[PDB]
Structure 1
Amino acid sequence: PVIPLDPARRPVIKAQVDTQTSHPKTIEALLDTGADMTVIPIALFSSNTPLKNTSVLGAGGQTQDHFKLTSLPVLIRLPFRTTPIVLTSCLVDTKNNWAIIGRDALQQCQGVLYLP
């Protein structure tokens, strides 16, 4: 659909996220054209699954251990999408519990930004 842009209303969408480490869960994710990679809350994984370390660009500069990387792909389903989005890797939020749909996912939705 068309998602209007308003500073007062975050552009969020409901997405079913399959971490492949527990049952799929529908969560509210922010549609973020500025995000190179999707961000998923660690609450969506098991506490017995391996994640890999890595640096990430963030609003505070550089955060070492805030974000982890997934080890298995993550499949993401949209309300209007029969087929799943498959991201070879995406970030995992071990603290803030952020849900961010980045450009990696938006590319597979054939999603675009339109400025009249």
Structure 2
Amino acid sequence: PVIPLDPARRPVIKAQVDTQTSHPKTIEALLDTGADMTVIPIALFSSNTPLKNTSVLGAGGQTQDHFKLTSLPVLIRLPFRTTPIVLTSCLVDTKNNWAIIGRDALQQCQGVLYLP
């Protein structure tokens, strides 16, 4: 669909995420064209699960430990397209539990920004 843009209202989507380490789960994710890589909560993963360390730059400054990287690809299912996004690797937010669809995912479902 066409998603209008409003400063008062985060553009969100219901995404079903399969981390491949426990059953798939629905999350509300922020559609974010300024994110290089998708971010998913640690709450999706299991207490076991190897995850790599990774340095991440945001508006809040630089961080060594808030975000980790996935060991295995993450499958994402959007409500419309029957065919999953498969991200080879993506970020895992261990501090807050943010959910951010980034351009890695948006490219794979051929998302565009349209400015009239």
TM-score range, shorter chain: over 0.9
Deviation at 1:57, TM superposition (A): 1.1
CA RMSD of superposed structures (Å)? 0.5
Structure 2 unaligned residues grouped into runs of 5+: none
Percent identical among aligned pairs is: 100
Deviation at 1:60, TM superposition (A): 1.6
Deviation at 1:65, TM superposition (A): 0.3
Deviations 1:72-95 (A, max 9, x none): 000000000101100000000001
Deviations 1:13-49 (A, max 9, x none): 0000000010000110000000000000000011100
Q: Secondary structure at the match of 1:79?
A: coil
How many Å separate the matches in 2 of 1:40 and 1:98? 6
Q: Secondary structure at the match of 2:20?
A: coil
TM-score, normalised relative to structure 2: 0.99
What residue number does 2:44 align with? 44
Q: Secondary structure at the match of 1:15?
A: strand
Structure 1 unaligned residues grouped into runs of 5+: none
Aligned residue pairs total: 116
What residue number does 2:115 align with? 115
4+ long deviations beyond 3 Å: none
TM-score, normalised relative to structure 1: 0.99
